[PDB]
């Protein structure tokens, strides 16, 4: 075979050429923190959360984008990997709004959870945060853009899976806004799935909005009947009442998406 040997924390693993650092760490059972990487979207590399130390190399690499070279020792838990994660989590939480009680992502937030797991416990940002104009992209997806961390899973999903090309980033620098630039209504057949992949509560479900909260929901694994695809879903209920419908991953059917009628 053409498998190259790399090392994750000293453990040998045989990987295909072209495999990234993140996938090599996944093959030894370690999940690198990420915000913009998504395994069904194109590699962006613009949140810098996956920065990891390769040893004998004085610069961290973006594990979601960097291919492994033969003989690398990926240090997923070293001192400068943790310092990189804390610095990037500090910059993500600098201008992020204190909305966790009134945000629907609370409890099932990637930003909350891997701030608890990989960032620090306190703030140094002594300034005033930014605030972003909200957008009206339709009756399904509520949009609160102050919570946006600009990971561009919006744009990659709408471009590559939904095939729409109507989301994007306007502006430049810290005023860079994810949006449509116009009053445009993002109504695709797969338009609600951006609620899934948005790691923050910038894009939430407008019908699910404010009604429940993820830890109190019971997760019943079930099947879509809205068409003959047979999409695997999670009906999340709460005290004998159906709260919402999430997808299940099935690699051969619905990869991890569902349609808007299903959702």
């Amino acid at each position: 075979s053409n498998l190259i040997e790399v090392f994750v924390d000293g453990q040998s693993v045989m990987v295909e050429p072209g495999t990234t650092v993140l996938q090599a760490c996944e093959k030894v059972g370690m999940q690198i923190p990420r915000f913009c990487y998504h395994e069904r979207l194109s590699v962006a590399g613009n949140c810098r959360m996956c920065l990891v130390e390769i040893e004998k190399a004085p610069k961290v690499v973006a594990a979601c984008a960097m291919p492994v070279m033969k003989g690398w020792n990926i240090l997923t838990n070293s001192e400068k990997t943790k310092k990189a994660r804390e610095g990037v989590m500090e910059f993500l939480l600098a201008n992020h709004p204190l909305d966790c009680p009134i945000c629907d992502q609370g409890g099932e937030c990637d930003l909350q959870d891997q701030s608890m797991m990989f960032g620090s416990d306190r703030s140094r940002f002594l300034e005033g945060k930014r605030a972003v104009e909200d957008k009206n992209i339709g009756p399904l997806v509520k949009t609160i853009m102050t919570r946006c961390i600009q990971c561009t899973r919006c744009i990659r999903f709408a471009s590559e899976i939904a095939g729409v090309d109507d989301l994007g980033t306007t502006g430049r620098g810290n005023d860079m806004q994810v949006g449509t630039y116009i009053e445009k209504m993002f109504m695709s057949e797969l338009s609600g799935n951006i609620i899934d992949i948005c790691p923050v509560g910038a894009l939430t479900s407008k019908p699910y909005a404010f009604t429940a909260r993820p830890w109190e929901t019971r997760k019943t694994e079930s099947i879509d009947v809205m068409d003959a695809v047979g999409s695997n879903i999670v009906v999340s209920t709460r005290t004998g009442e159906v709260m919402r419908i999430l997808p299940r991953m099935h690699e051969d059917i619905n990869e991890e998406w569902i349609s808007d009628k299903t959702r």
């Binding site: 709004p97 608890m116 416990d121």
Partner: protein
């Protein structure tokens, strides 16, 4: 008149506490410990807190440790007032009950000033204590301690040299040292037998290696030397309270790890990291690294221990609670042989038995 066999049937207050701990988080399971030895609330809080802090590999700040030792000895005064005065009340001496429950009312006022509840404070937490001392509390603890020795002296006037009290205690419930060690006795039940053992001295916790006190040791293994050991432990608790009021350090009262102890409400409303940590510590809770500890304190009834098993989640996988009264009431059958029926209530009094911790 003699007692041949004593079979204590228990479980009348079995509540399934430590199964209810398995479906709750660590902060959520803390107020079950107020309700086990329900005269020794903050001590059981301390034993659970030390167990969780040992499994979390963190330590409380020094002022939190001095507050825990101060309120542990206030709590020890509470429990030995309860012990001695109900042990005298069941025998017939009903008057120092009322004389000492006013002092016990004032120590419940201390609990309520520091936490908001008179008994179940939920005040000693994993990471420190919940809230700092309000201003003027240490002055009133000093005003209590300055007068409490006279209360012990008039209790000891009413009971110690009383020949009716000595007839009901001196040759009653004699426990040898080897049988006390084999029956799992702890605390005063060992110390009346002459065993020199005290977990505040031998296996010390928060700042008990920095306070100076004495351990009262019995000679005859009976109800009367255990009475004298509890009276002298009230004396030494007053001594430790004086040393805690003089050596109270400045500083913070929670550990300054905001992934374990919740942040301040002023910075929860200002900082993003603090709001996230407040959110996750009050909804999920902190994850405890996997492992099993047996953390024991010298509670006022004896060795109070928690065998806490964590699986890496925010909820205890297992929390076994060792109470002193469980092994004490198991040894009741040996301690009551060769005695009378009216001696059985005195032996149930000299074993300080609260059935909340006995039954869980």
């Amino acid at each position: 008149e003699m007692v041949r066999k004593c079979d204590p049937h228990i479980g009348l207050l079995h509540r399934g506490t430590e199964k209810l701990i398995e479906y709750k988080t660590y902060l959520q399971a803390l107020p079950y410990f107020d309700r086990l030895d329900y005269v020794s609330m903050m001590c059981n809080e301390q034993a659970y807190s030390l167990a969780v802090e040992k499994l979390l590999n963190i330590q409380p700040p020094p002022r939190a440790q001095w507050i825990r030792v101060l309120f542990g000895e206030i709590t020890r005064l509470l429990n030995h007032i309860m012990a001695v005065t109900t042990h005298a009340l069941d025998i017939g001496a009903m008057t120092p009950f009322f004389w000492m429950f006013e002092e016990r009312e004032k120590m419940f006022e201390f609990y309520e000033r520091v936490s908001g509840a008179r008994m179940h404070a939920a005040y000693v937490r994993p990471g420190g204590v919940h809230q700092d001392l309000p201003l003027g509390l240490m002055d009133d603890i000093y005003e209590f301690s300055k007068n409490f020795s006279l209360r012990i002296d008039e209790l000891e006037e009413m009971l110690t040299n009383n020949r009716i009290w000595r007839n009901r205690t001196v040759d009653i419930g004699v426990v040898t040292a080897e049988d006390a060690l084999n029956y799992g006795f702890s605390g005063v039940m060992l110390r009346g037998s002459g065993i020199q053992w005290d977990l505040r001295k031998t296996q010390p916790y928060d700042v008990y290696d920095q306070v100076e006190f004495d351990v009262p040791i019995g000679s005859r293994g009976d109800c009367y030397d255990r009475y004298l050991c509890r009276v002298e432990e009230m004396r030494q608790s007053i001594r430790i309270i004086s040393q805690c009021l003089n050596k109270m350090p400045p500083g913070e009262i929670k550990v300054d790890d905001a992934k374990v102890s919740p942040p301040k409400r002023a910075e929860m409303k200002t900082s993003m990291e603090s709001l996230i940590h407040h959110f996750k510590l009050y909804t999920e809770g902190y994850q405890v690294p996997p492992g099993a500890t047996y953390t024991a304190i010298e509670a006022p009834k004896g060795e109070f221990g928690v065998y806490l098993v964590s699986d890496g989640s925010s909820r205890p996988y297992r929390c076994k609670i060792k109470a002193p009264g469980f092994a004490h009431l198991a040894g009741l059958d040996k301690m009551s042989k060769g005695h009378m029926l009216a001696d059985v209530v005195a032996i149930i009094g000299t074993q300080d038995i609260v059935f909340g911790e006995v039954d869980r």
